[PDB]
């Protein structure tokens, strides 16, 4: 028995109405159950028997059901409710869970900072030559880095790490890696980062000069 | 109030075995099933096994049936999850719970792998209103780095990214504050990284 859950993610403000569905690929009669997952934390039992609210868990949240469809709603969405949600049958031997629901908290635009960081003294001995891009304090998540090498623009040579929604701004950060051999960094002048974000009316670069201090 | 632990995950060799333990307290798991369900990343969450500690009778997923063993001793009220043949599929945190599953533990993290231990480089990120400095933390296996700055005292605007794994084979993360600028030639600002798994702990002065 299978467990299709829409949609995958969602952002909303404090107090709205949010709805959260499964469907089952057959009969699960009520044997549907919907869990809260925060990251590093353990799975918590929300809903139970598709209905029914377990004990300590807030009234604003509640489940129903009609025929293969179960939905998880929260009537009003205070900012503890932020995690992703899982829904499972136990109708059948396995139990199945759905792919879950990321649901993030909605907020006013920030454009990033940007910072640009050459590669270290240190790593540079060991022949190496990583080079750092930061974005701070943005919002919403999409951005895009472009890396810049004597203006050539580069391609699979870079990575990037987004962090989760910051506790208490609910904004991103984001780094980016450039790395290169030492032989590779020094045949070039100018490294460049430029960012694109809906925050900026324009794409911001930050940029500096291989071996100026 | 109920509560489940789970304890020795670890970093093994593919082909290889380890078990796992499920302690119960507040409850005695005569009167339940115990189920081990597991988060392989980007997997979701799936049930691997279950057991009825009463009469020992257990379930399998398909994916683990034969080379795993689900058991229970009643008496020290744990349950257990001897894995064997084990697959790089198989890398997850495995939680486990009762019977709805109303309680689980906070999960093992289990990383199969031929790879040896290694320890991270820690670059700093120097500075170069507001301005942001970091560290790099590069070049170590298997996950996890922990790292905090001024040994736990600033954590204010501390922001540190997801591990990303290069196509070494090895992680490598950073982590960025911003500090005030004001405070850059006097403020010292120090990047304390731990990485268990190798017992390396790195303490980086991050300077302008």
């Known amino acids: 028995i299978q467990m299709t859950q829409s949609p995958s993610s969602l952002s909303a403000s404090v107090g709205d109405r949010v709805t959260i569905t499964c469907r089952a690929s057959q009969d699960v009669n009520t044997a549907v159950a919907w869990y809260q997952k925060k990251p590093g934390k353990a799975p918590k039992l929300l809903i139970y028997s598709a209905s029914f609210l377990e004990s300590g868990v807030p009234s604003r949240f509640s489940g129903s059901r009609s025929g293969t469809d179960f939905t998880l709603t929260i009537s009003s969405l205070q900012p503890e409710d932020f995690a992703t949600y899982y829904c499972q049958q136990h109708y059948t031997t396995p139990p199945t869970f759905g792919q879950g629901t990321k649901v993030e908290i909605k907020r006013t635009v920030a454009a990033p900072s940007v910072a640009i960081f050459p590669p270290s003294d240190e790593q540079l001995k060991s022949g190496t030559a990583s080079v750092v891009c930061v974005l701070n304090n943005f919002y919403p998540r999409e951005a895009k880095v472009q890396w810049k090498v004597d203006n050539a623009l580069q391609s699979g040579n870079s990575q990037e790490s987004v962090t989760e929604q910051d506790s208490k701004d609910s904004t991103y950060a984001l780094f980016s890696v450039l790395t290169l051999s030492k032989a590779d960094y020094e045949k070039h002048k100018v490294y460049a980062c430029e960012v694109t974000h809906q925050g900026l009316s324009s794409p911001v670069t930050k940029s500096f000069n291989r071996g100026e201090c | 109030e109920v509560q489940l632990v789970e304890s020795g995950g670890g970093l093994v060799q593919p082909g290889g075995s380890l078990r796992l333990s499920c302690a119960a307290s507040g409850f005695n798991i005569k009167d339940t099933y115990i189920h081990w369900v597991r988060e392989a990343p980007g997997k979701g969450l799936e049930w691997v096994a279950r057991?009825?500690?009463?009469?020992?009778?257990?379930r399998y997923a398909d994916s683990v049936k034969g080379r795993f063993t689900i058991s229970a001793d009643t008496s020290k009220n744990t349950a257990y999850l001897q894995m064997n043949s084990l697959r790089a599929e198989d890398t997850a945190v495995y939680y486990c719970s009762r019977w709805a599953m109303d309680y689980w533990g906070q999960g093992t993290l289990v990383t199969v792998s031929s790879a040896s231990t290694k320890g991270p480089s820690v670059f700093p990120l120097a500075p170069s209103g507001t301005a942001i400095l970091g560290c790099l933390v590069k070049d170590y296996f298997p996950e996890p780095v922990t790292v905090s700055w001024n040994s736990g005292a600033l954590t204010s605007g501390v922001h540190t990214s997801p591990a990303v794994l290069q196509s070494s084979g090895l992680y490598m993360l950073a982590s960025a504050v911003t500090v005030p600028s004001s405070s850059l030639g006097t403020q010292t600002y120090i990047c304390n990284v731990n990485h268990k798994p190798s017992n390396t702990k790195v303490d980086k002065k991050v300077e302008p």
């Open positions: 057991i009825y500690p009463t009469n020992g009778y257990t």
